[PDB]
Amino acid sequence: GVFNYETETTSVIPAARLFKAFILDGDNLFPKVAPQAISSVENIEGNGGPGTIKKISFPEGFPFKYVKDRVDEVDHTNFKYNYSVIEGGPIGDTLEKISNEIKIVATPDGGSILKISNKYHTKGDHEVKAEQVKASKEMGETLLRAVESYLLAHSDAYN
Ligand SMILES: O=C1C[C@@H](c2ccc(O)cc2)Oc2cc(O)cc(O)c21
Numbered sequence: 001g002v003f004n005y006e007t008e009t010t011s012v013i014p015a016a017r018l019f020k021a022f023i024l025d026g027d028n029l030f031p032k033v034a035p036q037a038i039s040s041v042e043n044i045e046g047n048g049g050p051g052t053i054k055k056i057s058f059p060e061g062f063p064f065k066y067v068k069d070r071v072d073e074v075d076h077t078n079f080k081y082n083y084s085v086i087e088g089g090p091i092g093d094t095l096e097k098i099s100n101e102i103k104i105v106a107t108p109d110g111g112s113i114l115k116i117s118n119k120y121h122t123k124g125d126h127e128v129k130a131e132q133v134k135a136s137k138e139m140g141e142t143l144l145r146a147v148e149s150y151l152l153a154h155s156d157a158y159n
């Protein structure tokens with residue numbers, strides 16, 4: 001079955017620039033700006049659109065070794081990005097996939113709002129726990145804040 005979790009957070013970076021950096025260039029940026037959160041990102045197959053598979057490795061001492069993520073949809077107009085965790089980490093005999101949807105919306109102050117949905121698809125019925133959801137949220141926030149700091153400090157990056 002499916003467990004749905006939604007959250008929202010804000011950024012001081014305009015939506016299109018944040019989407020270009022945080023979403024479209026995370027493979028380069030995450031290991032650079034948050035090496036204590038993501039050790040590397042490997043492109044396994046695909047050229048960035050639907051179906052592209054990446055292997056995200058975590059640093060030593062993290063709960064999980066890696067996950068493989070698959071790009072589902074990339075909407076460059078509406079700043080929507082859908083991707084799924086399809087192997088590694090929590091995926092296995094209790095959890096088949098985690099489907100994620102991010103939407104970045106502009107705010108008139110020149111920042112943005114990120115709307116995030118995480119859908120856990122379980123095999124049989126193995127409750128998803130609050131700590132697993134919390135860990136995902138914390139990781140996404142850490143990565144967001146690291147990218148935001150980089151964008152603030154490198155004005156010529158990503159426009
Ligand atoms: O669940 C996620 C996904 C994460 C993320 C987005 C895009 C990407 O390419 C990789 C990770 O962003 C987030 C940012 C948050 O503040 C809280 C979150 O829960 C999340």
Ligand code: NA
Pocket residue numbers: 116118133136137140
């Ligand atoms: Na999350």
